[PDB]
Amino acid sequence: GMLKNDQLDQWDRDNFFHPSTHLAQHARGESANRVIKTASGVFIEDRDGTKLLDAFAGLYCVNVGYGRQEIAEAIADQARELAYYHSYVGHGTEASITLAKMILDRAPKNMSKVYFGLGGSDANETNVKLIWYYNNILGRPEKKKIISRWRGYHGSGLVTGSLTGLELFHKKFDLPVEQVIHTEAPYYFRREDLNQTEEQFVAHCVAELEALIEREGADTIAAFIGEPILGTGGIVPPPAGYWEAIQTVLNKHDILLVADEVVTGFGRLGTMFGSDHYGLEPDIITIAKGLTSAYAPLSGSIVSDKVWKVLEQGTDENGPIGHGWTYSAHPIGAAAGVANLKLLDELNLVSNAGEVGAYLNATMAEALSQHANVGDVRGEGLLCAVEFVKDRDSRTFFDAADKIGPQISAKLLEQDKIIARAMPQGDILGFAPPFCLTRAEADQVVEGTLRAVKAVLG
Amino acid sequence: GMLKNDQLDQWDRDNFFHPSTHLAQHARGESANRVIKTASGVFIEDRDGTKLLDAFAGLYCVNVGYGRQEIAEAIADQARELAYYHSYVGHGTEASITLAKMILDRAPKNMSKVYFGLGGSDANETNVKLIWYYNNILGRPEKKKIISRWRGYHGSGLVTGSLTGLELFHKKFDLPVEQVIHTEAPYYFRREDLNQTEEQFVAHCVAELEALIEREGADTIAAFIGEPILGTGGIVPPPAGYWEAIQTVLNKHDILLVADEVVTGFGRLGTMFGSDHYGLEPDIITIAKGLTSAYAPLSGSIVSDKVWKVLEQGTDENGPIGHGWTYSAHPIGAAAGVANLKLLDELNLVSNAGEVGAYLNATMAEALSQHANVGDVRGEGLLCAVEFVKDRDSRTFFDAADKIGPQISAKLLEQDKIIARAMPQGDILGFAPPFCLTRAEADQVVEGTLRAVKAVLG
């Protein structure tokens, strides 16, 4: 009852260090906490019984939807039979072996093997470690730098937070580390020179990349990491012709491409892989989130035949790979993943992401694009964002201190019980809903946002 | 049947990149793979039905034992109700809140809050990031170096693998990074000067630490990371008076102590925390493995009141902490953890770890210590190791290329179906059995090892 609910809140404030939280305010009871109880479809429900339409799918991850007992039961069955054994020295479970095979059946054809982690950050950590091993095995001790992009999101660790190009993950943490260098954000709407057509901006990004390579020396650069479409950096589709232009430079200079598909992996764009959707030829692919639809933690580093051949050479020369996580290939994550991928196909949800996603984008644009303070409405599949500007013709942004994005998001939740995220480093309202979203539910997200935008900005 | 079993093996070799494995041999079918099906008590069982006594508890982690349906069912209940919601911006579940409170009730009294990760490596990654933030908030941009020890094990990532002091995690990976410096392995049996008493070796370790601090400059050193008892580096209890002597130096120079309790956390020594057992006053504690008994992935970074006060100041000054993992506080890991800690108390297993552990150590010493080729038999609680030497009086080690440890371990498994691990960088047979081990089962481990040692070395 009330007394247990108040005790939980107190235990929470007194003992629980939450991610991405104002720690002093939470511990002091100045900021609100919230306890989620259950969920179903595109809705979550707190312990007081309040039902919220989650247009963010947790954190771009509850892709099949909430309350899928097919997955809950797949987890229960594994938990009963064998919750855990390690996967060191060729050990495995039927679940992990089966999941490995299913990932590679769905991954781009140049892919060879998948190594299992627990989250997207550790998968990118693994990716860099393997890139350094790779260059070492090939006799290129100098070819180690990693090129990332401003506004990229690749994790929250020390090396992975350096790959990330958002100051929230850098300031006060001494990042980025020296081995990571950043190039231009693939964000046409924020381009320095407003006179550039989209093709001119792509040309500019090419020149910026060439200038960085020229300065650092190509023989010192191992890899380029990019999300096919930016997620946390603002739900930003890449410009037309961008990925073709960028890969031409990477090939010329013998720089590996890492496609960070943590958000786009397993259907969000309406195509199983964003690499395939946007036309990337990666040598390494990062996966997590939509692998298990967050039902159980699990990640992946998919490696191409090219990389795998060198890894085989390295192990022939040096013995067993010196890399392992205790919980690599954890049977519950694998069981969750096998159930999730089957459900994704069974419920035809990739197709739904593309259709209702095209519909959410079209109707959101039509209802908001002509607002005086809406600079842009953009997206692809079930990814959509609305960016706010103080003046459109000049592209004057509100002052950051005015918290326009955070206010609009808070208004959408308080007025309409819809969860949409105020993205960092801008006034951007983002949407990443479960793939089971219906047009009726999309209509409600659009109508609620328009009301939240009018309530804050008129 | 046979055809499905052969297909799984093929899928395994063709698609699954295992941790800690000879990758080329596994992919080529030259090394054996193995599929675990089920498990119960201290035994695991492969798909062919072969039953193995696991004297390593997975990887020092299946502490309550295998087949505990109390935990499997706790996971099933959470999976059904709410498998996942994020814990960002003060969000939580009853499971995570409850687990946070239970951890702090059991942790040393100077502890304030716990932040949840997925594994031990990401927890140590979090620890370093927080140490850098801490120093930054205090106005000490230079106080950032981390002192680790040779033979320490702190993870398999880039920064965490640098903290680690075992060459397997360094060679071909360009580690350790420059921010990590290593001091003396707290390993009396391998001391350079055989004439040193245990007290003299502790004095030597003190002098070595002072020499490193003097060279680097104390104002540049933030923290010292140590396992209370070495695990992967050889199951090495610390010398008598070591932790008292070391902390005197750390206090004098204002260097934080991080107790890496990933193996020792939650009872393995027969005391809930190894910090308490060995008398450490840490400011940060790392936990994983025995938190959930590996039933579900989860880790923790426990922070003291001292660190927490500065973190509260930092958030007051800079806003929400720029650190988060999607799967931080994952409800299934939390549910697994709550069930696990209750079962640990209910079945009186911490007490059993200390008793049957004292018995395993005593009887292993008595049965092997007088063998010509046994340099040492050591341990504490349910941790035990036997170290092999070509000549005892001189302490001549076999040549590494002779693989004495790996052969003995392989013999123990092939003759007696008992799993014991050949530790890296030495000829050391290690034991870390589930806390439910009986004296009868310990007798079988001792008797099987003696037979494996006689079969290889006479």
Side-chain angles (χ1 to χ4, degrees), chain A residues 1-36 38-50 52-170 172-243 245-280 282-365 367-369 371-389 391-402 404-413 415-416 418-453 455-458, chain B residues 1-36 38-50 52-170 172-243 245-280 282-365 367-369 371-389 391-402 404-413 415-416 418-453 455-458:
Chain A
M2 295 279 293
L3 302 183
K4 181 199 177 194
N5 290 9
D6 291 350
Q7 193 181 47
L8 203 65
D9 294 352
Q10 167 206 296
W11 288 351
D12 183 358
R13 298 181 190 285
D14 291 357
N15 304 282
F16 192 169
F17 176 169
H18 292 248
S20 192
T21 292
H22 196 302
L23 302 178
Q25 280 179 14
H26 181 91
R28 288 192 301 248
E30 298 169 357
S31 53
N33 69 320
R34 199 167 203 165
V35 190
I36 306 305
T38 196
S40 186
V42 300
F43 295 86
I44 68 182
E45 179 188 324
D46 104 315
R47 83 230 178 123
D48 295 332
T50 311
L52 300 177
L53 185 167
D54 188 6
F56 220 73
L59 289 167
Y60 322 82
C61 56
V62 187
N63 294 359
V64 291
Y66 289 96
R68 297 299 185 168
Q69 301 297 325
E70 299 83 344
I71 308 177
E73 295 306 328
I75 285 169
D77 293 337
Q78 188 60 55
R80 294 192 186 107
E81 194 187 35
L82 180 72
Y84 176 83
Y85 194 69
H86 70 67
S87 66
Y88 284 38
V89 193
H91 287 63
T93 60
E94 179 180 354
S96 42
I97 295 167
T98 309
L99 185 59
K101 170 57 171 167
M102 285 174 82
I103 292 170
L104 282 291
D105 281 347
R106 286 161 177 77
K109 63 181 193 163
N110 65 330
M111 283 315 104
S112 174
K113 308 289 176 292
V114 63
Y115 173 84
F116 292 110
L118 289 299
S121 293
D122 68 59
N124 282 324
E125 182 85 342
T126 291
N127 294 351
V128 176
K129 177 162 169 202
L130 290 174
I131 293 172
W132 295 348
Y133 182 87
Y134 177 80
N135 276 288
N136 278 335
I137 300 309
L138 294 177
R140 317 194 292 192
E142 304 307 301
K143 198 164 180 75
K144 306 297 177 57
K145 299 167 181 166
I146 318 289
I147 299 176
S148 197
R149 310 171 296 175
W150 291 114
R151 301 198 77 96
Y153 188 76
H154 305 290
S156 189
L158 296 177
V159 173
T160 57
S162 296
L163 293 172
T164 289
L166 289 172
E167 71 182 331
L168 177 64
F169 300 88
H170 292 166
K172 308 296 183 170
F173 304 118
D174 294 349
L175 307 177
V177 300
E178 210 198 17
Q179 302 92 324
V180 176
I181 50 174
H182 297 81
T183 198
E184 187 72 20
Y187 199 169
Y188 179 69
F189 176 78
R190 291 285 194 79
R191 69 198 177 292
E192 281 166 312
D193 181 3
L194 288 164
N195 296 327
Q196 295 181 338
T197 60
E198 212 183 11
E199 190 186 358
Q200 292 171 334
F201 178 69
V202 172
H204 173 67
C205 294
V206 169
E208 278 289 328
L209 185 50
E210 291 282 6
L212 182 59
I213 292 175
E214 176 64 16
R215 190 195 60 179
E216 296 299 323
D219 297 342
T220 73
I221 305 166
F224 182 108
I225 192 168
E227 295 155 277
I229 167 167
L230 297 185
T232 296
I235 295 154
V236 191
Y242 172 88
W243 279 116
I246 293 304
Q247 289 170 103
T248 294
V249 173
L250 303 176
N251 291 334
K252 163 163 152 284
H253 295 292
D254 205 16
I255 298 170
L256 293 167
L257 177 62
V258 182
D260 185 340
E261 296 221 42
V262 167
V263 162
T264 64
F266 306 105
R268 185 171 286 286
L269 302 170
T271 303
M272 186 78 75
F273 284 81
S275 281
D276 284 335
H277 190 89
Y278 285 117
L280 287 69
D283 271 297
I284 302 188
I285 303 180
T286 318
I287 57 163
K289 292 172 188 157
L291 176 52
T292 55
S293 284
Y295 278 86
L298 199 71
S299 65
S301 292
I302 324 183
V303 298
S304 66
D305 300 313
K306 187 166 80 194
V307 173
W308 185 259
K309 186 172 170 201
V310 174
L311 296 175
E312 282 187 339
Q313 175 184 350
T315 53
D316 279 338
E317 301 177 352
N318 304 285
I321 197 89
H323 183 61
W325 313 127
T326 302
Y327 298 147
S328 177
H330 197 288
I332 283 177
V338 165
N340 180 59
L341 293 183
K342 273 152 40 186
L343 202 58
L344 193 65
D345 282 356
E346 292 165 6
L347 299 174
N348 196 36
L349 291 155
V350 171
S351 183
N352 199 61
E355 292 173 1
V356 176
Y359 179 82
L360 177 70
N361 277 300
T363 56
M364 183 78 68
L368 278 172
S369 75
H371 189 281
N373 299 117
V374 162
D376 200 26
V377 172
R378 57 177 175 258
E380 182 75 353
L382 277 175
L383 285 161
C384 178
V386 169
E387 179 153 28
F388 307 106
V389 295
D391 179 64
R392 289 169 57 173
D393 203 297
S394 65
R395 197 188 63 201
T396 296
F397 298 98
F398 293 95
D399 189 326
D402 294 10
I404 295 305
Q407 287 180 59
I408 294 190
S409 166
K411 189 63 71 184
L412 182 62
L413 179 69
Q415 285 177 170
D416 282 315
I418 299 185
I419 303 170
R421 211 153 297 264
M423 310 306 290
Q425 215 170 301
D427 290 315
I428 302 155
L429 188 60
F431 308 82
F435 308 170
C436 57
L437 193 72
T438 60
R439 294 171 179 83
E441 289 160 338
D443 291 336
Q444 304 180 26
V445 181
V446 172
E447 293 158 22
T449 296
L450 180 45
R451 285 194 284 284
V453 173
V456 172
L457 300 183
Chain B
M2 295 279 293
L3 302 183
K4 181 199 177 194
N5 290 9
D6 291 350
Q7 193 181 47
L8 203 65
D9 294 352
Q10 167 206 296
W11 288 351
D12 183 358
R13 298 181 190 285
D14 291 357
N15 304 282
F16 192 169
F17 176 169
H18 292 248
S20 192
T21 292
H22 196 302
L23 302 178
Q25 280 179 14
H26 181 91
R28 288 192 301 248
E30 298 169 357
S31 53
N33 69 320
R34 199 167 203 165
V35 190
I36 306 305
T38 196
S40 186
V42 300
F43 295 85
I44 68 182
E45 179 188 324
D46 104 315
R47 83 230 178 123
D48 295 332
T50 311
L52 300 177
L53 185 167
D54 188 6
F56 220 73
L59 289 167
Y60 322 82
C61 56
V62 187
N63 294 359
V64 291
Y66 289 96
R68 297 299 185 168
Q69 301 297 325
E70 299 83 344
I71 308 177
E73 295 306 328
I75 285 169
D77 293 337
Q78 188 60 55
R80 294 192 186 107
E81 194 187 35
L82 180 72
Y84 176 83
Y85 194 69
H86 70 67
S87 66
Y88 284 38
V89 193
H91 287 63
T93 60
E94 179 180 354
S96 42
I97 295 167
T98 309
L99 185 59
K101 170 57 171 167
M102 285 174 82
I103 292 170
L104 282 291
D105 281 347
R106 286 161 177 77
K109 63 181 193 163
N110 65 330
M111 283 315 104
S112 174
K113 308 289 176 292
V114 63
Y115 173 84
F116 292 110
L118 289 299
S121 293
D122 68 59
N124 282 324
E125 182 85 342
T126 291
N127 294 351
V128 176
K129 177 162 169 202
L130 290 174
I131 293 172
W132 295 348
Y133 182 87
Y134 177 80
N135 276 288
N136 278 335
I137 300 309
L138 294 177
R140 317 194 292 192
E142 304 307 301
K143 198 164 180 75
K144 306 297 177 57
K145 299 167 181 166
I146 318 289
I147 299 176
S148 197
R149 310 171 296 175
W150 291 114
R151 301 198 77 96
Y153 188 76
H154 305 290
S156 189
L158 296 177
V159 173
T160 57
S162 296
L163 293 172
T164 289
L166 289 172
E167 71 182 331
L168 177 64
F169 300 88
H170 292 166
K172 308 296 183 170
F173 304 118
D174 294 349
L175 307 177
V177 300
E178 210 198 17
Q179 302 92 324
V180 176
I181 50 174
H182 297 81
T183 198
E184 187 72 20
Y187 199 169
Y188 179 69
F189 176 78
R190 291 285 194 79
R191 69 198 177 292
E192 281 166 312
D193 181 3
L194 288 164
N195 296 327
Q196 295 181 338
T197 60
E198 212 183 11
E199 190 186 358
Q200 292 171 334
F201 178 69
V202 172
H204 173 67
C205 294
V206 169
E208 278 289 328
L209 185 50
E210 291 282 6
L212 182 59
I213 292 175
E214 176 64 16
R215 190 195 60 179
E216 296 299 323
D219 297 342
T220 73
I221 305 166
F224 182 108
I225 192 168
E227 295 155 277
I229 167 167
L230 297 185
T232 296
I235 295 154
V236 191
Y242 172 88
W243 279 116
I246 293 304
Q247 289 170 103
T248 294
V249 173
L250 303 176
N251 291 334
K252 163 163 152 284
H253 295 292
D254 205 16
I255 298 170
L256 293 167
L257 177 62
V258 182
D260 185 340
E261 296 221 42
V262 167
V263 162
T264 64
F266 306 105
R268 185 171 286 286
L269 302 170
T271 303
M272 186 78 75
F273 284 81
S275 281
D276 284 335
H277 190 89
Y278 285 117
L280 287 69
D283 271 297
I284 302 188
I285 303 180
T286 318
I287 57 163
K289 292 172 188 157
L291 176 52
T292 55
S293 284
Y295 278 86
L298 199 71
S299 65
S301 292
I302 324 183
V303 298
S304 66
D305 300 313
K306 187 166 80 194
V307 173
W308 185 259
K309 186 172 170 201
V310 174
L311 296 175
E312 282 187 339
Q313 175 184 350
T315 53
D316 279 338
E317 301 177 352
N318 304 285
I321 197 89
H323 183 61
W325 313 127
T326 302
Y327 298 147
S328 177
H330 197 288
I332 283 177
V338 165
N340 180 59
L341 293 183
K342 273 152 40 186
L343 202 58
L344 193 65
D345 282 356
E346 292 165 6
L347 299 174
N348 196 36
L349 291 155
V350 171
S351 183
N352 199 61
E355 292 173 1
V356 176
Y359 179 82
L360 177 70
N361 277 300
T363 56
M364 183 78 68
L368 278 172
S369 75
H371 189 281
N373 299 117
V374 162
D376 200 26
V377 172
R378 57 177 175 258
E380 182 75 353
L382 277 175
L383 285 161
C384 178
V386 169
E387 179 153 28
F388 307 106
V389 295
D391 179 64
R392 289 169 57 173
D393 203 297
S394 65
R395 197 188 63 201
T396 296
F397 298 98
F398 293 95
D399 189 326
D402 294 10
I404 295 305
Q407 287 180 59
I408 294 190
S409 166
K411 189 63 71 184
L412 182 62
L413 179 69
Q415 285 177 170
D416 282 315
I418 299 185
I419 303 170
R421 211 153 297 264
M423 310 306 290
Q425 215 170 301
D427 290 315
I428 302 155
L429 188 60
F431 308 82
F435 308 170
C436 57
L437 193 72
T438 60
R439 294 171 179 83
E441 289 160 338
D443 291 336
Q444 304 180 26
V445 181
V446 172
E447 293 158 22
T449 296
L450 180 45
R451 285 194 284 284
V453 173
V456 172
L457 300 183

PDB file of all heavy atoms in Angstrom, chain A residues 347-367, unseen atoms left out:
ATOM      1  N   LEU A 347       5.084 -11.903 -36.524  1.00  0.00           N
ATOM      2  CA  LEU A 347       4.165 -10.767 -36.471  1.00  0.00           C
ATOM      3  C   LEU A 347       4.362  -9.738 -37.596  1.00  0.00           C
ATOM      4  O   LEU A 347       3.699  -8.712 -37.592  1.00  0.00           O
ATOM      5  CB  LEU A 347       4.241 -10.093 -35.098  1.00  0.00           C
ATOM      6  CG  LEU A 347       3.851 -11.025 -33.942  1.00  0.00           C
ATOM      7  CD1 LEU A 347       4.084 -10.343 -32.600  1.00  0.00           C
ATOM      8  CD2 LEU A 347       2.389 -11.538 -34.067  1.00  0.00           C
ATOM      9  N   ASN A 348       5.219 -10.037 -38.573  1.00  0.00           N
ATOM     10  CA  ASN A 348       5.479  -9.147 -39.727  1.00  0.00           C
ATOM     11  C   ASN A 348       5.806  -7.683 -39.325  1.00  0.00           C
ATOM     12  O   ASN A 348       5.448  -6.733 -40.037  1.00  0.00           O
ATOM     13  CB  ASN A 348       4.253  -9.193 -40.661  1.00  0.00           C
ATOM     14  CG  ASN A 348       4.533  -8.628 -42.074  1.00  0.00           C
ATOM     15  OD1 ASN A 348       5.624  -8.796 -42.641  1.00  0.00           O
ATOM     16  ND2 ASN A 348       3.517  -7.992 -42.659  1.00  0.00           N
ATOM     17  N   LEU A 349       6.498  -7.524 -38.187  1.00  0.00           N
ATOM     18  CA  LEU A 349       6.760  -6.204 -37.604  1.00  0.00           C
ATOM     19  C   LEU A 349       7.784  -5.307 -38.317  1.00  0.00           C
ATOM     20  O   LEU A 349       7.734  -4.112 -38.126  1.00  0.00           O
ATOM     21  CB  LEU A 349       7.098  -6.331 -36.118  1.00  0.00           C
ATOM     22  CG  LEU A 349       5.983  -6.759 -35.150  1.00  0.00           C
ATOM     23  CD1 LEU A 349       6.583  -7.384 -33.947  1.00  0.00           C
ATOM     24  CD2 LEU A 349       5.011  -5.647 -34.724  1.00  0.00           C
ATOM     25  N   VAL A 350       8.692  -5.863 -39.108  1.00  0.00           N
ATOM     26  CA  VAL A 350       9.651  -5.053 -39.855  1.00  0.00           C
ATOM     27  C   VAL A 350       8.895  -4.258 -40.923  1.00  0.00           C
ATOM     28  O   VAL A 350       9.142  -3.064 -41.155  1.00  0.00           O
ATOM     29  CB  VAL A 350      10.781  -5.898 -40.500  1.00  0.00           C
ATOM     30  CG1 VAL A 350      11.604  -5.050 -41.443  1.00  0.00           C
ATOM     31  CG2 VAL A 350      11.680  -6.521 -39.413  1.00  0.00           C
ATOM     32  N   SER A 351       7.956  -4.946 -41.564  1.00  0.00           N
ATOM     33  CA  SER A 351       7.083  -4.349 -42.556  1.00  0.00           C
ATOM     34  C   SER A 351       6.205  -3.294 -41.891  1.00  0.00           C
ATOM     35  O   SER A 351       5.985  -2.234 -42.458  1.00  0.00           O
ATOM     36  CB  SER A 351       6.242  -5.439 -43.202  1.00  0.00           C
ATOM     37  OG  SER A 351       5.433  -4.899 -44.231  1.00  0.00           O
ATOM     38  N   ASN A 352       5.722  -3.555 -40.680  1.00  0.00           N
ATOM     39  CA  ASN A 352       4.908  -2.574 -40.003  1.00  0.00           C
ATOM     40  C   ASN A 352       5.718  -1.303 -39.640  1.00  0.00           C
ATOM     41  O   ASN A 352       5.180  -0.200 -39.686  1.00  0.00           O
ATOM     42  CB  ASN A 352       4.236  -3.140 -38.741  1.00  0.00           C
ATOM     43  CG  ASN A 352       3.029  -2.283 -38.301  1.00  0.00           C
ATOM     44  OD1 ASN A 352       2.072  -2.146 -39.068  1.00  0.00           O
ATOM     45  ND2 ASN A 352       3.080  -1.689 -37.099  1.00  0.00           N
ATOM     46  N   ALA A 353       6.988  -1.477 -39.249  1.00  0.00           N
ATOM     47  CA  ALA A 353       7.892  -0.355 -38.900  1.00  0.00           C
ATOM     48  C   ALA A 353       8.034   0.590 -40.090  1.00  0.00           C
ATOM     49  O   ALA A 353       7.977   1.792 -39.929  1.00  0.00           O
ATOM     50  CB  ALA A 353       9.280  -0.876 -38.479  1.00  0.00           C
ATOM     51  N   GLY A 354       8.214   0.028 -41.277  1.00  0.00           N
ATOM     52  CA  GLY A 354       8.349   0.802 -42.505  1.00  0.00           C
ATOM     53  C   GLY A 354       7.080   1.525 -42.928  1.00  0.00           C
ATOM     54  O   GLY A 354       7.142   2.689 -43.333  1.00  0.00           O
ATOM     55  N   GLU A 355       5.934   0.841 -42.812  1.00  0.00           N
ATOM     56  CA  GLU A 355       4.616   1.406 -43.158  1.00  0.00           C
ATOM     57  C   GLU A 355       4.097   2.422 -42.193  1.00  0.00           C
ATOM     58  O   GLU A 355       3.782   3.526 -42.587  1.00  0.00           O
ATOM     59  CB  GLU A 355       3.540   0.323 -43.258  1.00  0.00           C
ATOM     60  CG  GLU A 355       3.717  -0.618 -44.414  1.00  0.00           C
ATOM     61  CD  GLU A 355       2.712  -1.797 -44.396  1.00  0.00           C
ATOM     62  OE1 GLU A 355       1.832  -1.896 -43.464  1.00  0.00           O
ATOM     63  OE2 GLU A 355       2.818  -2.634 -45.346  1.00  0.00           O
ATOM     64  N   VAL A 356       3.939   2.048 -40.937  1.00  0.00           N
ATOM     65  CA  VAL A 356       3.404   2.978 -39.976  1.00  0.00           C
ATOM     66  C   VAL A 356       4.446   4.065 -39.655  1.00  0.00           C
ATOM     67  O   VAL A 356       4.097   5.140 -39.152  1.00  0.00           O
ATOM     68  CB  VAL A 356       2.902   2.246 -38.730  1.00  0.00           C
ATOM     69  CG1 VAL A 356       2.438   3.234 -37.671  1.00  0.00           C
ATOM     70  CG2 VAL A 356       1.787   1.297 -39.141  1.00  0.00           C
ATOM     71  N   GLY A 357       5.720   3.750 -39.924  1.00  0.00           N
ATOM     72  CA  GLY A 357       6.815   4.699 -39.770  1.00  0.00           C
ATOM     73  C   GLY A 357       6.718   5.746 -40.874  1.00  0.00           C
ATOM     74  O   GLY A 357       6.837   6.915 -40.599  1.00  0.00           O
ATOM     75  N   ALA A 358       6.523   5.326 -42.116  1.00  0.00           N
ATOM     76  CA  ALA A 358       6.303   6.277 -43.218  1.00  0.00           C
ATOM     77  C   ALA A 358       5.078   7.144 -42.961  1.00  0.00           C
ATOM     78  O   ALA A 358       5.053   8.338 -43.311  1.00  0.00           O
ATOM     79  CB  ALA A 358       6.152   5.554 -44.580  1.00  0.00           C
ATOM     80  N   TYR A 359       4.066   6.554 -42.330  1.00  0.00           N
ATOM     81  CA  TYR A 359       2.856   7.263 -41.962  1.00  0.00           C
ATOM     82  C   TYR A 359       3.087   8.253 -40.802  1.00  0.00           C
ATOM     83  O   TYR A 359       2.587   9.384 -40.851  1.00  0.00           O
ATOM     84  CB  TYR A 359       1.738   6.260 -41.630  1.00  0.00           C
ATOM     85  CG  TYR A 359       0.454   6.918 -41.221  1.00  0.00           C
ATOM     86  CD1 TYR A 359      -0.451   7.399 -42.172  1.00  0.00           C
ATOM     87  CD2 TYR A 359       0.158   7.092 -39.893  1.00  0.00           C
ATOM     88  CE1 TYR A 359      -1.626   8.031 -41.780  1.00  0.00           C
ATOM     89  CE2 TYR A 359      -1.005   7.705 -39.487  1.00  0.00           C
ATOM     90  CZ  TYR A 359      -1.900   8.172 -40.422  1.00  0.00           C
ATOM     91  OH  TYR A 359      -3.043   8.778 -39.952  1.00  0.00           O
ATOM     92  N   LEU A 360       3.833   7.857 -39.773  1.00  0.00           N
ATOM     93  CA  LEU A 360       4.124   8.764 -38.645  1.00  0.00           C
ATOM     94  C   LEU A 360       4.932   9.996 -39.124  1.00  0.00           C
ATOM     95  O   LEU A 360       4.664  11.118 -38.690  1.00  0.00           O
ATOM     96  CB  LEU A 360       4.891   8.053 -37.530  1.00  0.00           C
ATOM     97  CG  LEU A 360       5.320   8.912 -36.327  1.00  0.00           C
ATOM     98  CD1 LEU A 360       4.152   9.365 -35.443  1.00  0.00           C
ATOM     99  CD2 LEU A 360       6.326   8.126 -35.498  1.00  0.00           C
ATOM    100  N   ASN A 361       5.905   9.761 -39.999  1.00  0.00           N
ATOM    101  CA  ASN A 361       6.729  10.813 -40.548  1.00  0.00           C
ATOM    102  C   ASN A 361       5.904  11.790 -41.381  1.00  0.00           C
ATOM    103  O   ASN A 361       5.972  12.974 -41.126  1.00  0.00           O
ATOM    104  CB  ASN A 361       7.919  10.248 -41.349  1.00  0.00           C
ATOM    105  CG  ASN A 361       9.105   9.864 -40.464  1.00  0.00           C
ATOM    106  OD1 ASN A 361       9.676  10.712 -39.748  1.00  0.00           O
ATOM    107  ND2 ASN A 361       9.497   8.595 -40.524  1.00  0.00           N
ATOM    108  N   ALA A 362       5.104  11.270 -42.315  1.00  0.00           N
ATOM    109  CA  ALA A 362       4.227  12.070 -43.220  1.00  0.00           C
ATOM    110  C   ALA A 362       3.208  12.939 -42.506  1.00  0.00           C
ATOM    111  O   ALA A 362       3.106  14.130 -42.809  1.00  0.00           O
ATOM    112  CB  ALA A 362       3.521  11.186 -44.236  1.00  0.00           C
ATOM    113  N   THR A 363       2.493  12.355 -41.550  1.00  0.00           N
ATOM    114  CA  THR A 363       1.485  13.065 -40.782  1.00  0.00           C
ATOM    115  C   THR A 363       2.105  14.036 -39.752  1.00  0.00           C
ATOM    116  O   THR A 363       1.508  15.078 -39.447  1.00  0.00           O
ATOM    117  CB  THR A 363       0.481  12.074 -40.107  1.00  0.00           C
ATOM    118  OG1 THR A 363       1.214  11.151 -39.291  1.00  0.00           O
ATOM    119  CG2 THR A 363      -0.337  11.270 -41.154  1.00  0.00           C
ATOM    120  N   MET A 364       3.289  13.724 -39.216  1.00  0.00           N
ATOM    121  CA  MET A 364       3.926  14.638 -38.264  1.00  0.00           C
ATOM    122  C   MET A 364       4.407  15.883 -38.984  1.00  0.00           C
ATOM    123  O   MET A 364       4.336  16.982 -38.446  1.00  0.00           O
ATOM    124  CB  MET A 364       5.137  13.993 -37.556  1.00  0.00           C
ATOM    125  CG  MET A 364       5.774  14.870 -36.517  1.00  0.00           C
ATOM    126  SD  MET A 364       4.833  14.967 -34.819  1.00  0.00           S
ATOM    127  CE  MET A 364       5.133  13.101 -34.205  1.00  0.00           C
ATOM    128  N   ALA A 365       4.933  15.687 -40.192  1.00  0.00           N
ATOM    129  CA  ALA A 365       5.414  16.780 -41.021  1.00  0.00           C
ATOM    130  C   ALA A 365       4.212  17.675 -41.340  1.00  0.00           C
ATOM    131  O   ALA A 365       4.230  18.846 -40.995  1.00  0.00           O
ATOM    132  CB  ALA A 365       6.061  16.243 -42.296  1.00  0.00           C
ATOM    133  N   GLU A 366       3.157  17.098 -41.922  1.00  0.00           N
ATOM    134  CA  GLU A 366       1.923  17.837 -42.283  1.00  0.00           C
ATOM    135  C   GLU A 366       1.296  18.610 -41.137  1.00  0.00           C
ATOM    136  O   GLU A 366       0.834  19.724 -41.352  1.00  0.00           O
ATOM    137  CB  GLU A 366       0.866  16.913 -42.916  1.00  0.00           C
ATOM    138  CG  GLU A 366      -0.307  17.656 -43.603  1.00  0.00           C
ATOM    139  N   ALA A 367       1.314  18.077 -39.922  1.00  0.00           N
ATOM    140  CA  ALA A 367       0.717  18.765 -38.780  1.00  0.00           C
ATOM    141  C   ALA A 367       1.583  19.823 -38.095  1.00  0.00           C
ATOM    142  O   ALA A 367       1.060  20.664 -37.355  1.00  0.00           O
ATOM    143  CB  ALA A 367       0.295  17.755 -37.760  1.00  0.00           C
TER     144      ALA A 367
END
